Amino acid sequence: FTHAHIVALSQHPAALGTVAVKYQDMIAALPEATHEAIVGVGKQWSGARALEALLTVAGELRGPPLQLDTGQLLKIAKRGGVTAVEAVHAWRNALTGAPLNLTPEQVVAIASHDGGKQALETVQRLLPVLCQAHGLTPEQVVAIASNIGGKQALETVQRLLPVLCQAHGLTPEQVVAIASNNGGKQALETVQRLLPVLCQAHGLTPEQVVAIASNNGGKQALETVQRLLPVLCQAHGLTPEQVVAIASNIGGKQALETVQRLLPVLCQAHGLTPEQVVAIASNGGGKQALETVQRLLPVLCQAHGLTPEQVVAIASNIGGKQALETVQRLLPVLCQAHGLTPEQVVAIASHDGGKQALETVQRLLPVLCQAHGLTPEQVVAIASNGGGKQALETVQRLLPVLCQAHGLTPEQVVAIASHDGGKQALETVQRLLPVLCQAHGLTPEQVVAIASHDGGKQALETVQRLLPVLCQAHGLTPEQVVAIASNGGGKQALETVQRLLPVLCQAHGLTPEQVVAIASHDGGKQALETVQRLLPVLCQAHGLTPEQVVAIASNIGGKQALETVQRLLPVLCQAHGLTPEQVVAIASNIGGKQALETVQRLLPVLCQAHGLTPEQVVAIASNGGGRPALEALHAVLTDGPEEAKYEALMRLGGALAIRISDNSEKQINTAINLIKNHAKSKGVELSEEDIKKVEKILKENPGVVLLLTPSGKIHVFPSISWSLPEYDGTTTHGVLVLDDGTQIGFTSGNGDPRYTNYRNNGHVAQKSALYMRENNISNATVYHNNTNGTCGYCNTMTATFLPEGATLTVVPPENAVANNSRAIDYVKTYTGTS
DNA sequence: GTCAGGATACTCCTCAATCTACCGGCCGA
DNA sequence: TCGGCCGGTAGATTGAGGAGTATCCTGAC
Ligand SMILES: [Zn+2]
Fold first, then answer.
1. In this structure, what are the phi and psi dihedrals at residue A717, rounded to the nearest 5 degrees?
2. Is the CB of A629 under 7 A from strand B?
């Protein structure tokens, strides 16, 4: 023992005398009893009595009925106390091997709580009653009973479950959720008393009240919500959803009161928007984070050079105040000694338990970098995760054995550990790699792929359990099982497949390959359940073939896409004139729900005001990331530079940009003829009045640029300069000059669909040659802004599109430098052949 | 001796967006 | 042999947000 241990036992004076006298036989009856466990047991309210009970009982308690090891006994004595140990001794054979049928783990979980003897006797006397009359799962009863004051929770559940289920319409799962917390009797009683008042007077959804009251001290949160809903909604302009999001956390009453007190201070003296404040306060212990922000925002923003956004990001997590003080204390030493940039420190500190991650990084960066050969970036990657302290310690402990005995490489171990719960995945790999690679015929790279994702331990265990079942009974392949399991929540996907594969392949006429394809993404359980529920509805009520539904579902958010298609098929098919194929194509992408909703919102605006044919909007949305693309296009079009609108509308495709040189009548007539030819090619009539108006605007404004979109409307750009834009490395701009002097704008991309076979399709020279062929132009000259010169393919395939006898002169920019063996930096003429 | 409220820290799942490697029919110099 | 200022397909990161589990603490009887 050390002086710190004696200080620890100083809380219980009788334990200090007991330990110093009977230490010889405590370790004798309890092998592998460390000093920390002893000081933890002895410093409780009954430390001496608990140690005496452990000495007396642990010798025989390890029998067949319980077979509890020394760790379980120490945990019971530390948490339950001497009374819990005595109760367990008195009821060794009553709890297990009886109609109760409780495994030793459940008994240990129930007993190792404050006042756990009462919980043990109460679960003993109510388990048959709760299981028979009220139809409660024994696991649920054990979950309710394993809480501080769990006897009161059990009694209140027995008294009030029928009332809550009948007179208030709550499922038994919800009541079990409410009553599985400390002081659950108070939460149940307050829910029963205040459910109507909150649901009708304050307009609260019953599930919202349940979410509020399913936390520790939920009675206080409910009463505080009732008290402070009008104040925060009216005097501070907070939507009720924000208030119920604040209050749905442990200590939500304190968070609500602190918000009500400090919102004006944090909003009129620190420059924080209310959204930032309610994001800070929407986490466990949000009052502490709010107060620490109010105290340390100037210090961390003026001396340590952190933006307020970084401070809000650090403080928007569980234990945010601990992270804020740790950042203040450790930023100079983590930056001026260990070499981390402040962004990396902020990234490490921006997760739950960020204080532990930062302290562990400061402690273990040199040893992990030197003894194990890890890069600092790898250590930061491991640490920038929830529970990163545990992952770093596990990496330090298990890198040699995993790299040497199991044949893994450090990169594989780091990849496994760089995830939430990476310690569990590492331990599970180190335990299960031989049996998986020997009995089930897997390979180490497959095991690493399975274990890399979050919940890799659960996926590994589920694979080790279900691979023979799925491969023999259901006729799958080990590769298909590995593909299903190599995703986030792969255990749920594996179980859902093992349940629904015969049903899906028999009732709905699907294919095992189709099921494996749907199940091989994140939320594959959700996608499988949605497919099983909605395949008939989509097939008859909307006329969608099963292949289309499988194509929609085989995406990361497939459930959301399927529900969005169900909701939005008729309105988009009728109110917007979209074929079902277009909606299916839009939704058959990651984030297809967002694309569908964005199309719903922004189809009329782009179609009527701007000049976008529905085909262009569908094509933009039919790609991945459809919402950001549509939003960016709308933002550029509604308010942006004239040039930027020019490139956006050119890249949309199908547009013709024409600029005149002189106000002579002949050039105006030629431009009108070209516009008419393009419009007839697009199949839209320009009408005489619009032709007269555009001729007037062309003859009255010199240097104006006209843009004819496929929709029909003509955009006018009066000032977009007389020179080619500087090359941006992504898009090339070209100007075609004819004999008279008119200039035609071209942009790389959007090639001719019937010439996809050509490797020069979509290039500026190819587009110019196609334009010359379509408009019957004898000769022309192209100026492009690309500094890499003409493409290699366009050097030989250009004189294949333009008609024979036509001369096209390509002129690269003066400062062009060829980057390839086939590019050209000099002016070149092209004459076509047959 | 038991109970309640709060407080952190860690683990597993679902969804969205972006990035990257890949292929492919058609040409003369 | 050797050249894509293109576009589709498929996979592989990146990031966020939301739940669920777990241990601890103080104050009050
Ligand atoms: Zn080219």
1. -115, 105
2. yes
